[PDB]
RNA sequence: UGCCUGGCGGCCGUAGCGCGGUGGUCCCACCUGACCCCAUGCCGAACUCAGAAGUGAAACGCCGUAGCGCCGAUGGUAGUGUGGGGUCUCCCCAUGCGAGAGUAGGGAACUGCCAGGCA
RNA sequence: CCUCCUAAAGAGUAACGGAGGAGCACGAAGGUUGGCUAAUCCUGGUCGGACAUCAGGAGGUUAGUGCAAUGGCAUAAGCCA
RNA sequence: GCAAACUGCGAAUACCGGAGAAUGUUAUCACGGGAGACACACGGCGGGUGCUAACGUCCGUC
């Protein structure tokens, strides 16, 4: 909720005047943020998966959950663990990342507008996690990055563009 | 959809209870109110019904939905049903979780003398 | 290189605890005042009349027993 | 508009149908509208005679029953796979 | 005695899907924050706490839309029991039972009890 | 020892007629109560190529239901606690 | 386009169960005694096997 009040104060007015919605919640709003490094290299050994889980726990305020597969992978093989938030941690983590993580990107050519699901969600993988200062260089084992997929109530790609612009959408 | 899953869950309870043909006491939880009814085995008729919407319960309640409101509703329905002569009737939480308002209402009813 | 089908029929009078139909799968489901076995073998819970009907969201075939 | 006259069916079943077919005749029905549909007995020879013209199936036909002419449209015709015989003609009142 | 909503049954496609508008009077739905009752195989997602802070966005509510799905006559046809016949492989005769598909049409489900709001 | 047809629509109705599997196990892989509900294909995303990864979409069991086969399981007999 | 091991549809004969008419030496069932009986065949009805070539062979029924 660190940025929730600021969001409601600033994004809502501009989005309402540029769209002229009726209800307060008609503005697209993020519901969950997914952090899941698709390392896909723990097949040989699970130590890498343990290291990834530890990194997720350190970076995030919670502990990751280990999932299983739906490449030479069997059924029910645990390969990666994902992290998601729902609550104040949403805005806390988003504000932190947009303050320190997103601005500090090396060779930052910009986001990918086309990288949508076609229905109001954006998915992309940003490598060289060194952008996040929370990543301690002591415990880094390989060049990795977060496969962030923003989950938003946007009903179309136009709403996704508008809500990304609300966060100033640095550039393409 | 939460409604679909809730109805799916309640259907099993209802269909397993229907084998006995006994008057059911169905309680429904609403975000703003609480409903409680006693229905005969046929299901097309109800013996008694009371909800927080009625002034009889909301007069002393600042709001219709909370632990205190659930307890008051339970006491009222228990008194009315005891006046009716339930004689060890069966309860049903509309396929819900016995956690809050349902739990408080059931505890209040059992305090009044409910035999279930 | 043992016996399926309908053994007891609607409108018949049977004594308590009488097997009416055994089914390989759930082709039929026991109705009111009717029990079910491990092998989905329906047996009469009382004495009276037997009815075969079709009901349910999928229109499944059901077997019921009513007071004579 | 064709001056077509037929006879009302008196029996229900395959018996009269086969009797008509053997004697170079066949049955038919007239339905459509709130008025109750009725079965009719069409003579095969006359049907062949007045169906050769292409206008038979074009406009609304006239059927005469007990000296009563009514407008009916031929819904469909069912024929034998190889025998040029009309198994059954279905009409609609118009 | 009427219009509207909620709960519970018969009803299980003439009850479903597609389009428009209509609703915050009551009621209903979303929801704020949650250290407090409670909690996650991580998360107030659900569960539970103070309510209308905000709204009718989805949802449901009515009607029209027969677009779609569905049912569906009426006859006839196929098939066939019984007895017989022929050129007895197969077909037909007398009688009875009577397909599927298709067709006109129906098709915006209906019905029962309680509770609440407006007349 | 067991399942599918062969086989003329109650049960049965010859084959050396064609398919076959099983000689297993669980102190859980049973039960109690609670919670949840797949396959199939597609969109975005370094390796990852389209399918090692998550989010969303058509849909709600054609996944799964420890053993070969066949019927059944949405109330889930399917998964977890 | 196909499917004895395809059914999204779906017949009459055959079954017992309930009500009902006349029928027929009770034509129906149990018990007890006493039998033969344990190699049938022709044709028709719908099939399998067999090379539907078979006046070959086997099935349920008259």
Numbering used by the authors:
A (entry chain F): 1 to 70, 76 to 177
B (entry chain O): 2 to 117
C (entry chain W): 6, 15 to 81
D (entry chain V): 1 to 94
Text taken from the publication that reported this structure:
The E. coli 50S large ribosomal subunit is composed of 33 proteins (L-proteins), one 23S and one 5S rRNA. The 23S rRNA consists of six architectural domains that, stabilized by the L-proteins, define the shape of the 50S subunit with its three protuberances. Here, we present a biochemical and cryo-EM based analysis of the earliest period of 50S assembly, utilizing an in vitro reconstitution system with purified rRNA and L-protein components. Taken together, early 50S assembly occurs in a domain-wise fashion, while late 50S assembly proceeds incrementally.
In addition, we noticed that the 5S RNP (ribonucleoprotein particle), consisting of 5S rRNA, uL5, uL18, and bL25, can dock on a pre-50S particle as soon as the central region of domain II has formed. This can occur both in early (d12-CP, d126-CP) and late assembly (C-CP) and goes along with formation of domain II helices H38 (A-site finger) and H42 (GAC), as well as domain V helices H80-H88, representing additional examples for rRNA induced rRNA stabilization or folding. However, the CP remains mobile and upon rotational movement of the 5S rRNA towards the subunit interface, H84 and H38 stabilize each other. The presence of domain II apparently facilitates docking of the CP-forming 5S RNP and as a consequence, route 1-2-6 involves the possibility of CP formation either on d12, or d126 resulting in d12-CP, or d126-CP, respectively.
